[PDB]
Each structure stands twice: as structure tokens, then as C-alpha cells.
Scaffold this active site. Structure first.
Site, PDB file in Angstrom:
ATOM      1  N   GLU A 180      48.872 -12.236 -44.294  1.00 47.38           N
ATOM      2  CA  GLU A 180      48.608 -12.436 -42.878  1.00 47.38           C
ATOM      3  C   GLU A 180      48.493 -11.112 -42.144  1.00 47.38           C
ATOM      4  O   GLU A 180      49.261 -10.171 -42.395  1.00 47.38           O
ATOM      5  CB  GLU A 180      49.752 -13.222 -42.241  1.00 47.38           C
ATOM      6  CG  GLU A 180      49.894 -14.592 -42.819  1.00 47.38           C
ATOM      7  CD  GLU A 180      51.065 -15.364 -42.265  1.00 47.38           C
ATOM      8  OE1 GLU A 180      51.820 -14.843 -41.423  1.00 47.38           O
ATOM      9  OE2 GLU A 180      51.212 -16.522 -42.678  1.00 47.38           O
ATOM     10  N   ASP A 229      44.088 -22.182 -40.843  1.00 47.58           N
ATOM     11  CA  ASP A 229      44.812 -23.165 -40.033  1.00 47.58           C
ATOM     12  C   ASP A 229      43.979 -23.692 -38.877  1.00 47.58           C
ATOM     13  O   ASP A 229      44.042 -23.197 -37.744  1.00 47.58           O
ATOM     14  CB  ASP A 229      46.194 -22.720 -39.556  1.00 47.58           C
ATOM     15  CG  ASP A 229      47.099 -23.907 -39.198  1.00 47.58           C
ATOM     16  OD1 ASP A 229      46.616 -25.067 -39.016  1.00 47.58           O
ATOM     17  OD2 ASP A 229      48.316 -23.654 -39.064  1.00 47.58           O
ATOM     18  N   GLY A 238      45.544 -11.022 -49.620  1.00 44.94           N
ATOM     19  CA  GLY A 238      45.991  -9.876 -48.833  1.00 44.94           C
ATOM     20  C   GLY A 238      47.068 -10.175 -47.817  1.00 44.94           C
ATOM     21  O   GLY A 238      47.661  -9.232 -47.290  1.00 44.94           O
ATOM     22  N   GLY A 260      55.766 -26.081 -42.684  1.00 45.42           N
ATOM     23  CA  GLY A 260      55.772 -26.547 -41.317  1.00 45.42           C
ATOM     24  C   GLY A 260      56.537 -27.847 -41.241  1.00 45.42           C
ATOM     25  O   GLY A 260      57.066 -28.342 -42.237  1.00 45.42           O
ATOM     26  N   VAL A 270      43.528 -16.287 -50.101  1.00 46.57           N
ATOM     27  CA  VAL A 270      43.283 -14.914 -49.675  1.00 46.57           C
ATOM     28  C   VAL A 270      44.556 -14.114 -49.933  1.00 46.57           C
ATOM     29  O   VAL A 270      45.537 -14.263 -49.198  1.00 46.57           O
ATOM     30  CB  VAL A 270      42.889 -14.865 -48.198  1.00 46.57           C
ATOM     31  CG1 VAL A 270      42.592 -13.417 -47.786  1.00 46.57           C
ATOM     32  CG2 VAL A 270      41.663 -15.758 -47.992  1.00 46.57           C
ATOM     33  N   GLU A 290      40.185 -21.722 -50.163  1.00 45.45           N
ATOM     34  CA  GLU A 290      40.206 -20.429 -50.835  1.00 45.45           C
ATOM     35  C   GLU A 290      41.553 -19.762 -50.589  1.00 45.45           C
ATOM     36  O   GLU A 290      42.164 -19.926 -49.532  1.00 45.45           O
ATOM     37  CB  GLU A 290      39.084 -19.542 -50.277  1.00 45.45           C
ATOM     38  CG  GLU A 290      38.988 -18.185 -50.981  1.00 45.45           C
ATOM     39  CD  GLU A 290      37.727 -17.358 -50.665  1.00 45.45           C
ATOM     40  OE1 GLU A 290      36.628 -17.937 -50.417  1.00 45.45           O
ATOM     41  OE2 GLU A 290      37.846 -16.106 -50.689  1.00 45.45           O
ATOM     42  N   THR A 306      50.830 -21.645 -29.940  1.00 40.46           N
ATOM     43  CA  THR A 306      52.098 -20.929 -29.868  1.00 40.46           C
ATOM     44  C   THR A 306      52.285 -20.332 -28.474  1.00 40.46           C
ATOM     45  O   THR A 306      51.323 -19.809 -27.876  1.00 40.46           O
ATOM     46  CB  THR A 306      52.208 -19.834 -30.966  1.00 40.46           C
ATOM     47  OG1 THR A 306      53.555 -19.335 -31.025  1.00 40.46           O
ATOM     48  CG2 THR A 306      51.297 -18.641 -30.704  1.00 40.46           C
ATOM     49  N   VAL A 351      51.942 -25.165 -47.593  1.00 34.44           N
ATOM     50  CA  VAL A 351      50.763 -24.631 -48.262  1.00 34.44           C
ATOM     51  C   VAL A 351      51.231 -23.940 -49.525  1.00 34.44           C
ATOM     52  O   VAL A 351      52.080 -23.045 -49.463  1.00 34.44           O
ATOM     53  CB  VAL A 351      49.956 -23.675 -47.369  1.00 34.44           C
ATOM     54  CG1 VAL A 351      49.102 -24.439 -46.404  1.00 34.44           C
ATOM     55  CG2 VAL A 351      50.873 -22.736 -46.609  1.00 34.44           C
ATOM     56  N   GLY A 390      54.223 -30.347 -43.374  1.00 33.43           N
ATOM     57  CA  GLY A 390      53.527 -30.022 -44.595  1.00 33.43           C
ATOM     58  C   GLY A 390      53.863 -28.630 -45.065  1.00 33.43           C
ATOM     59  O   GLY A 390      54.742 -27.957 -44.514  1.00 33.43           O
ATOM     60  N   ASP A 417      44.375 -22.015 -31.999  1.00 29.77           N
ATOM     61  CA  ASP A 417      45.584 -21.503 -32.645  1.00 29.77           C
ATOM     62  C   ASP A 417      45.440 -20.035 -33.006  1.00 29.77           C
ATOM     63  O   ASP A 417      45.941 -19.600 -34.041  1.00 29.77           O
ATOM     64  CB  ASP A 417      45.975 -22.356 -33.854  1.00 29.77           C
ATOM     65  CG  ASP A 417      47.463 -22.334 -34.136  1.00 29.77           C
ATOM     66  OD1 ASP A 417      48.237 -21.881 -33.280  1.00 29.77           O
ATOM     67  OD2 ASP A 417      47.847 -22.795 -35.222  1.00 29.77           O
ATOM     68  N   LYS A 465      46.384 -16.460 -33.417  1.00 30.49           N
ATOM     69  CA  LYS A 465      47.599 -15.654 -33.440  1.00 30.49           C
ATOM     70  C   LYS A 465      47.577 -14.880 -34.752  1.00 30.49           C
ATOM     71  O   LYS A 465      46.840 -15.255 -35.673  1.00 30.49           O
ATOM     72  CB  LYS A 465      48.855 -16.534 -33.354  1.00 30.49           C
ATOM     73  CG  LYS A 465      48.952 -17.569 -34.453  1.00 30.49           C
ATOM     74  CD  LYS A 465      50.181 -18.444 -34.246  1.00 30.49           C
ATOM     75  CE  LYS A 465      50.340 -19.480 -35.340  1.00 30.49           C
ATOM     76  NZ  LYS A 465      51.649 -20.181 -35.201  1.00 30.49           N
ATOM     77  N   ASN A 514      47.634 -16.452 -38.306  1.00 28.86           N
ATOM     78  CA  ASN A 514      46.529 -17.302 -38.747  1.00 28.86           C
ATOM     79  C   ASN A 514      45.301 -16.505 -39.161  1.00 28.86           C
ATOM     80  O   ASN A 514      44.242 -17.091 -39.368  1.00 28.86           O
ATOM     81  CB  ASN A 514      46.155 -18.331 -37.679  1.00 28.86           C
ATOM     82  CG  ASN A 514      47.132 -19.453 -37.615  1.00 28.86           C
ATOM     83  OD1 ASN A 514      47.968 -19.622 -38.520  1.00 28.86           O
ATOM     84  ND2 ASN A 514      47.013 -20.263 -36.594  1.00 28.86           N
ATOM     85  N   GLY A 547      53.979 -21.232 -47.459  1.00 24.29           N
ATOM     86  CA  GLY A 547      54.262 -21.467 -46.048  1.00 24.29           C
ATOM     87  C   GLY A 547      54.714 -22.887 -45.862  1.00 24.29           C
ATOM     88  O   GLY A 547      54.382 -23.747 -46.687  1.00 24.29           O
TER      89      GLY A 547
HETATM   90  C1  LIG Z   1      52.020 -26.715 -43.229  1.00 29.83           C
HETATM   91  O1  LIG Z   1      52.184 -25.298 -43.039  1.00 29.83           O
HETATM   92  C2  LIG Z   1      51.023 -24.663 -43.143  1.00 29.83           C
HETATM   93  O2  LIG Z   1      49.958 -25.186 -43.460  1.00 29.83           O
HETATM   94  C3  LIG Z   1      51.216 -23.244 -42.857  1.00 29.83           C
HETATM   95  C4  LIG Z   1      52.391 -22.718 -42.497  1.00 29.83           C
HETATM   96  O3  LIG Z   1      52.245 -21.229 -42.264  1.00 29.83           O
HETATM   97  C5  LIG Z   1      50.793 -21.116 -42.592  1.00 29.83           C
HETATM   98  C6  LIG Z   1      50.019 -19.852 -42.537  1.00 29.83           C
HETATM   99  C7  LIG Z   1      49.990 -19.304 -41.099  1.00 29.83           C
HETATM  100  O4  LIG Z   1      49.926 -20.416 -40.197  1.00 29.83           O
HETATM  101  N1  LIG Z   1      48.653 -19.952 -43.131  1.00 29.83           N
HETATM  102  C8  LIG Z   1      48.537 -20.182 -44.594  1.00 29.83           C
HETATM  103  C9  LIG Z   1      47.067 -20.189 -45.026  1.00 29.83           C
HETATM  104  C10 LIG Z   1      46.803 -19.979 -46.517  1.00 29.83           C
HETATM  105  O5  LIG Z   1      47.523 -18.876 -47.070  1.00 29.83           O
HETATM  106  C11 LIG Z   1      48.926 -18.884 -46.782  1.00 29.83           C
HETATM  107  C12 LIG Z   1      49.319 -19.081 -45.320  1.00 29.83           C
HETATM  108  N2  LIG Z   1      50.222 -22.313 -42.926  1.00 29.83           N
END
Ligand SMILES: COC(=O)c1coc([C@H](CO)NC2CCOCC2)n1
Length: 339
Positions: free
Chosen positions: A116, A173, A114, A41, A112, A110, A190, A46, A44, A155, A157, A160, A39
């Protein structure tokens, strides 16, 4: 109920001890192998990583300090790590390590596999009411826990909420989570999920989480959110009107619960009345829910996501793979001293 009261008292004691003495600097980057970006943003990303010594997989959130500063997210990132290292609940993703270097902040959580809830919801179309109710009950318990610690999540949604190997929710998140004893003012979250009082720039409180729960339950049971429109300005107009149209397939009990969670007047909104979360837990829509069995993870889940093992990334999306560069010079040391 004395057992809930005692549980929450202990939960607060344990949270406060970690809150007042946060852990810091419990791993470093070269202890991990990078696997895949899960993912991104504006400040940052992940990444799935593997610990080189144990072989364990983790979701490592990497925040670029300079971008955190530019996007005015310093306090939010400090909130996120301080809260995550202090909480403990069955439906919250666990922070395993955190550290920083010259360029980045790292939160190793951790993993996960499976995926979102968002993906599964969009794939299936909509969840049946029992299926939505199973997830909703976990959010209710999670918010009861967080709010008892004076934490607002801000947050909620479908993106998350991760679905774990047992089919239960893990909330991820905490970037907007904050310890708030009265009101707070930041515009964040959001658009489709924002309570009217956020849109109207008011001081707001934990009632915004209960509003967001109403949006989430509506979206799970309908397949789309209640205030849907093409642009945020039009979403905001619908939110502040609070006019909601329910699909005829919704049960009467679901509609009644949603009218009380999607109550524009925050002083009348379920979760924010004298009986607190109990107006939600005791609502007819939840009459079949065994709250303790949910907490103890003894209920059979509606479905188990398909995945091959703890390293499988097939339920997450593909992103361009970019460098994790660490500057030879420290950036923004002052701003992130406490991290
Ligand atoms: C900086 O960007 C983020 O930190 C970010 C962007 O999209 C997400 C999603 C849903 O928000 N959550 C992770 C949580 C861990 O497993 C994968 C997804 N995180």
C-alpha cells in the site's frame, strides 16, 4: 481534445457492454491454494492465493454473505463486483475471476506485491512534490475515466493505492464505488477523506472524489492529512470549516491547487466546474506532467518497491490466519442472485 474525447467515448462503450451483461461464476474456490491473509474487515478478508493449474498469484477478496447483510452492505458488494468486472484502466486493479458459494462472495483480483502507498508514505515520512505529483496524476486520470462512466469511487485514501512492480499506482477496493448519474446519499468513506457534503448528509456527486484527491495530495506532500484530529467528530468539525493550514514547505502552486480541491462549496470545487477535470490537468502544479506519458506508463517512477517476486508478501502486514469455511447450507441466496 479529440483524442481524449474519442478515448473516453470508446471507454464508455466498452464499459457499458460489460455493465449490461456482467460475467459471473468464472472460477471456484478449490482451484486455488490459500497462502496468507493480507487484510481484514468487518465482513470479509483478502487473501493471497495461488491458482493450482497456472501457478499465478491473486488477491482473493472473500466476503461473508451473512455479515454483508447484517452490515447493510448488499448493494455495495453488488456494485463493487459489477463495476470491477466492467472497467479497464491502467491504474485500476483487474478483476480476474468472481464466484460465490453457500457462504461467501469471491473477487479474485491481480496481486500487487509492492504494498500500500500508506506503508511507503509512513515509512518515508512525506513524498517530495514530484513524487506526490506522479501518483496524483494517475489518480486524476483514473477519476477522469471513472467519472466519464458515471462512476464515483468514494474510498480514496493511501491504503487503497497499491504500488506495482513499475512503481505505478493500482487503485484497489471498489466496495463503495457506485454508478451515479446525478446525486447519491450513502454515508461511507474514511473520516479524514470525507467531503463536507458527505458529513452534512447532503446529496452528493463526483465532486467528493476531487475533494478526497485534495486530501490525498496534501497527505502525500505533508505526511499527515489536512483535517487531522483525534476523534472523528473533531475531524468532521475541521472538514466543514475547511480551514486548512499548509506547511511552509509546500510550493505556492501546490497550495493553490489544494485550496481549489479542498473547496467546501462543491459548486466552486476543481473537478466540478464547467471545464471538469481540465481545471486540474491544466493547473500550474501539473505543468511538468506529460499526461499521455503517464497514461502509457512511459515515465520513470519515483521508486520501485522492494519485493522478491510475484508471491512476496513482505510489504503487507501479518494477520491471524482464520478458516475459509463454506456452509453445507446456502445462505442469503436471494440477496446475491445477481453476483
Ligand atoms: C475485507 O477487507 C478487505 O477487502 C481489505 C481490507 O484492507 C484492504 C486493503 C486496503 O483497503 N486492500 C487490499 C487489496 C489487495 O491487496 C491487499 C490489500 N482490503
Amino acid at each position: 481534445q479529440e483524442s481524449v474525447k474519442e478515448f473516453l467515448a470508446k471507454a464508455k462503450e466498452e464499459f457499458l457492454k460489460k455493465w449490461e451483461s456482467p460475467s459471473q461464476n468464472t472460477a471456484q474456490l478449490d482451484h486455488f491454494d490459500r497462502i496468507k491473509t493480507l487484510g481484514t474487515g468487518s465482513f470479509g478478508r483478502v487473501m493471497l492465493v495461488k491458482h493450482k493449474e497456472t501457478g499465478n498469484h491473486y488477491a482473493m477478496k472473500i466476503l461473508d454473505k451473512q455479515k454483508v447483510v447484517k452490515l447493510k452492505q448488499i448493494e455495495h458488494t453488488l456494485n463493487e463486483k459489477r463495476i470491477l468486472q466492467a472497467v479497464n484502466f491502467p491504474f485500476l486493479v483487474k478483476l480476474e475471476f468472481s464466484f460465490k458459494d453457500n457462504s461467501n462472495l469471491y473477487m479474485v483480483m491481480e496481486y500487487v506485491p509492492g504494498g500500500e502507498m500508506f506503508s511507503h508514505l509512513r515509512r518515508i515520512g512525506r513524498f517530495s512534490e514530484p513524487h506526490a505529483r506522479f501518483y496524483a496524476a494517475q489518480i486524476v486520470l483514473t477519476f477522469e475515466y471513472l467519472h466519464s462512466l458515471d462512476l464515483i469511487y468514494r474510498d480514496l485514501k493511501p491504503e487503497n493505492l497499491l504500488i506495482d512492480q513499475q512503481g505505478y499506482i493500482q487503485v484497489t477496493d471498489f466496495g463503495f464505488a457506485k454508478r451515479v448519474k446525478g446525486r447519491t446519499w450513502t454515508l461511507c468513506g474514511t473520516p479524514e477523506y470525507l467531503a463536507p457534503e458527505i458529513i452534512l448528509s447532503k446529496g452528493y456527486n463526483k465532486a467528493v472524489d476531487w475533494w478526497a484527491l485534495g486530501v490525498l495530495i496534501y497527505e502525500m506532500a505533508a505526511g499527515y492529512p489536512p483535517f487531522f484530529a483525534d476523534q472523528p467528530i473533531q475531524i468532521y468539525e475541521k472538514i466543514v470549516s475547511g480551514k486548512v493550514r499548509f506547511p511552509s514547505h509546500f510550493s505556492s502552486d501546490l497550495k493553490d491547487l489544494l485550496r481549489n480541491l479542498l473547496q467546501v462549496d462543491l459548486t466552486k470545487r476543481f473537478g466540478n466546474l464547467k471545464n471538469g477535470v481540465n481545471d486540474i490537468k491544466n493547473h500550474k502544479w501539473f505543468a511538468t506532467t506529460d499526461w499521455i506519458a503517464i497514461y502509457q506508463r512511459k515515465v520513470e517512477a519515483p521508486f520501485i518497491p522492494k519485493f522478491k517476486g510475484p508471491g512476496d508478501t513482505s510489504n503487507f502486514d501479518d494477520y491471524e490466519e482464520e478458516e475459509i469455511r463454506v456452509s453445507i447450507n446456502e445462505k442469503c441466496g436471494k440477496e446475491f442472485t445477481e453476483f
